[model samples]
Target: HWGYGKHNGPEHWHKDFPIAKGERQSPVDIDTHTAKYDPSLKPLSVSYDQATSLRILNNGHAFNVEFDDSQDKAVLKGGPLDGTYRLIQFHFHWGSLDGQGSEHTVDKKKYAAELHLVHWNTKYGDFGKAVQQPDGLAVLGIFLKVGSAKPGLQKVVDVLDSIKTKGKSADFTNFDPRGLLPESLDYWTYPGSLTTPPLLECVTWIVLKEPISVSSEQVLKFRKLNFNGEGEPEELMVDNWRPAQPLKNRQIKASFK
Candidate 1:
């Protein structure tokens, strides 16, 4: 019932997930010109141990690349964080067509897709408990533009065929997520919540200014994945993106002027 569609879309999410209408909701539009430039912001430090990548799953909403967070092998530090955040999972949201995907927009301009690298504060012990507290999660949002084929993503795309249906997952290890990020780490930082249901207001969003490129062929493959689980009628998974929510009473800070 919480799927991204006309009947159970973002608009109606609050009906079931009350926090969906909370003050600090996510996927907000980033107005670059109005964002404050914070010179004190530290450069992001990310270290991903390829060995920690465990598997990938089609969770009916998006394809989540799970990680072994039993230890702090892969972590994100610096930026707008108070403590080290351990990598837990990563996923993407894209459109069925061009120019209409990415959850977070820049100056009202939409990108082809958006990548979310989810991390939880190691201080909290685990994600389940951390999610209820402020500053418990840090999510890296990278915009994806359609142009050249991203060779770094070939490994992930290769396994899409094997896990095309909901609840399907495949062993996906030894894959470093850093390969999918852009060269520049310039970003906009703000406080928000999970873009999906139970929208807990605990995320520190770090959206990169530079976007990576992907081919049209590579993007179309994402649309082929079905939202329906095995044994159910096939429903093409496309436009799995939430529209920008109101910024409400938050300040967006930029790393660069």
Candidate 2:
């Protein structure tokens, strides 16, 4: 249901996914210049154990991978943030074309791409149930810059041979997503909804200030990923990201602590 187009796109999304009409839709621009934002919030943190079990899944949207659980369970610990947030999944949002890969933009400044690692409080068990709670979710927003190769993500690209074709996946053993994080965990935080449909307003967004780099060719490979099921070669499902939404009265915060 995520990729059904025609009348099924954003215009008529509510008809197919009721959550599309939620008060908050994701991919909001994080304005670091605003003085109203606080940097002391511990929005992002690292888990050495969570670093290992990053499982790469082919969830139709090109390549939707899950971290934390995919790695060693013990290492999937939460930071000093409020809830017992544990890393759950990580996924990418790209464009049909190379120029518009990212979902959120600052004053419409689109990047090469964006990555979202979804997490949630363990009190309600897993992400499926935890997301229902208001204080349940925490999302790490990492922006991808297209130019030079990003050292942080080379590990991901290394596995291209594994899932080179569509609907294919690997164990993702021994990779830590924490290494994928930028050195500066400093970020912009705000209360927002999911970028995808059934856009539940239950997320504490942590958009990183520092963006990593990638090669132009790497982005092209991402664009070439097919999601039209087996034997469907031309139906590539490249643009997997959502469009930006209005901030309304919400404030986005930065992390300095």
Segments in model 1 whose C-alpha atoms lie over 4 Å from true places: 49-51
lDDT of 1 by residue, 99-179 (tens): 888999999999999999999999999999889889999999999999999998989988999999999999998888878
Error of 1 at 42 (Å): 0.7
Q: By TM-score, who's the top model here? A: 1
- For candidate 2, what is the lDDT? 0.68
Off by over 4 Å in 2: 4-6, 68-80, 164-167
- Cα RMSD of predicted structure 2: 2.9
User: What are the clashing pairs of model 2?
Assistant: 39-256, 49-75, 50-75, 51-176, 53-70, 53-71, 189-253
lDDT of the candidates, in the order given:
0.92, 0.68
Per-residue alpha-carbon lDDT of candidate 2 for residues 1-257, written as tens digits (9 for 90 to 100): 65635645556767767767565667776565662455455444456553446567666665756555532352222333574567766778877665787877765778778888777777777778867877678777788887787665776776755665557888787766666667776666677887776778888776777877788777776766666655666666676777777677778665563
Evaluate residue 182 in candidate 2 and report its C-alpha lDDT on the 0 to 100 scale. Answer: 70
**Candidate whose lDDT is highest:** 1
